Design a binder for this molecule. Structure first.
Ligand SMILES: *[C@@H]1O[C@H](CO)[C@@H](O)[C@H](O)[C@H]1NC(C)=O
Ligand SMILES: *[C@@H]1O[C@H](CO)[C@@H](O)[C@H](O)[C@H]1NC(C)=O
Ligand SMILES: *[C@@H]1O[C@H](CO)[C@@H](O)[C@H](O)[C@H]1NC(C)=O
Ligand SMILES: *[C@@H]1O[C@H](CO)[C@@H](O)[C@H](O)[C@H]1NC(C)=O
Ligand SMILES: *[C@@H]1O[C@H](CO)[C@@H](O)[C@H](O)[C@H]1NC(C)=O
Ligand SMILES: *[C@@H]1O[C@H](CO)[C@@H](O)[C@H](O)[C@H]1NC(C)=O
Ligand SMILES: *[C@@H]1O[C@H](CO)[C@@H](O)[C@H](O)[C@H]1NC(C)=O
Ligand SMILES: *[C@@H]1O[C@H](CO)[C@@H](O)[C@H](O)[C@H]1NC(C)=O
Ligand SMILES: *[C@@H]1O[C@H](CO)[C@@H](O)[C@H](O)[C@H]1NC(C)=O
Ligand SMILES: *[C@@H]1O[C@H](CO)[C@@H](O)[C@H](O)[C@H]1NC(C)=O
Ligand SMILES: *[C@@H]1O[C@H](CO)[C@@H](O)[C@H](O)[C@H]1NC(C)=O
Ligand SMILES: *[C@@H]1O[C@H](CO)[C@@H](O)[C@H](O)[C@H]1NC(C)=O
Lengths: 135, 135, 135
């Protein structure tokens, strides 16, 4: 990345801003902007690139061979009982939340067992989070 | 990365800002901006790049071979009972939260068993968090 | 990275700012800005790069071989009972939170078993945290 910007409200190169209930009288504004941008990003000069994978098996006895990749979830139990017994009561639940395994952003790249790779990998995440808002 | 910016409210190269209830009279503003940017990022000059992987097995006896990658979750139990018994009571739950395994940002890169790689890996995360807001 | 900036409210190269209830009279502002930026970042000059992995097995007897990567979670138990018995009572729970394994930012890079890599790895995280706000 080159230019990553997070701005809460207002982003401006030039901002002539006047707010409310304001007197803006007898103003002479002169502005000259000579802006130039030159970009040379991700230039590659490879005369020879070689990726080689070789597997050779000869008169071999293989048994009980197990290969497991990443992210192996096994024998997982969730138990969230919710028992509510009432007896001449006044129940007032305004905003009650029961969240189980809530995912917002899941970015996965090159999650493998055997990988051979060359170059650039980029991940960018921007957000403005707000889970619960009870007024 | 080159230029990473976090700004809460206002980002400006030039900001002529006037707020409320203001008198802005008899003003002469003159502005000249000669801005130049030159960027030479991620330039690679490789005459010869070689990646080599070789596996050779000869008259070999392999048994009980186990390979497990990362992120191995096994035999995980969650138990969150919620028993509520009422007897002539006044229940007032305004904002009650029960959160189990809540994920917001999960970025995964090159999570493997065997990896051969070359270059640049970049991860950028920006956020403005707010979980619970009870007014 | 080159330029990492965190700013709470206001970021400005030039800020002519006038607040409220202000008298701004008889002002002569003259501004000249000659700004130049030159960037030469991440330049690589490799005549020959070699990565080599070789495995050779000969008349070998292998047994009970176990390889486990990172992040191995096994036999994990969570138990959070919540028993509430009422008897002519007045329950007032404004903002009660029960959080179990709450993740906000999880960035993972090159979490492997065997890794061969070359270059640049960058991780940048910016946030403005606020978990609980009970007014
Ligand atoms: C604004 O400029 C004009 C022309 O220069 C002038 O006649 C006028 O009086 C100015 N305003 C005030 C409030 O003086
Ligand atoms: C920008 O404009 C102003 C306005 O008169 C002038 O004086 C200045 O020479 C200009 N600059 C360029 C680089 O054109
Ligand atoms: C890539 O092309 C040629 C061959 O290597 C080289 O002379 C040139 O300078 C390179 N270009 C850049 C932008 O580096
Ligand atoms: C391992 O080998 C034994 C006997 O050779 C077999 O009973 C067992 O099932 C094998 N393991 C697996 C996971 O299959
Ligand atoms: C603003 O400028 C004009 C012209 O120069 C002038 O006549 C006027 O009196 C000025 N304003 C005030 C409040 O003096
Ligand atoms: C910018 O503009 C002002 C306005 O008169 C001028 O005096 C100055 O020479 C200018 N500069 C350039 C670099 O153009
Ligand atoms: C890459 O290209 C040629 C070959 O190595 C070299 O002369 C040149 O200076 C390089 N370019 C840059 C921008 O470094
Ligand atoms: C290991 O080998 C024994 C006998 O050789 C077998 O019973 C067992 O199942 C093997 N282990 C696995 C995990 O399969
Ligand atoms: C502002 O400038 C003008 C012109 O130079 C002048 O006539 C006026 O009196 C000034 N303002 C005040 C409040 O003196
Ligand atoms: C910037 O502008 C001012 C305005 O008169 C001028 O005096 C100065 O020479 C200028 N500088 C450049 C570098 O252009
Ligand atoms: C890379 O390219 C050539 C080959 O090594 C070298 O002469 C040049 O100075 C290098 N470029 C940079 C920007 O260092
Ligand atoms: C280790 O070997 C014994 C006998 O050789 C076998 O019973 C056992 O299961 C092996 N271990 C594993 C983890 O398989």
């Amino acid at each position: 990345s080159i230019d990553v910007k997070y701005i809460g409200v207002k982003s401006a190169y030039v901002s002539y801003d006047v707010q409310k209930r304001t007197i803006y009288l007898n103003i002479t504004n002169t502005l000259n902007i000579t802006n130039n941008n030159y970009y040379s990003v991700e230039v590659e000069n490879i005369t020879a690139q070689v990726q080689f994978s070789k597997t050779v098996i000869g008169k071999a006895r293989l048994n009980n061979i197990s290969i497991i990749g990443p992210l192996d979830m096994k024998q997982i139990d969730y138990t969230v009982p919710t028992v509510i017994a009432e007896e001449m009561s006044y129940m007032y639940d305004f905003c009650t939340l029961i969240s189980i395994k809530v995912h917002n952003i899941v970015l996965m790249m090159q999650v493998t067992v055997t990988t051979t790779y060359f170059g650039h990998s980029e991940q960018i995440s921007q957000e403005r989070y707000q889970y619960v808002d009870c007024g």
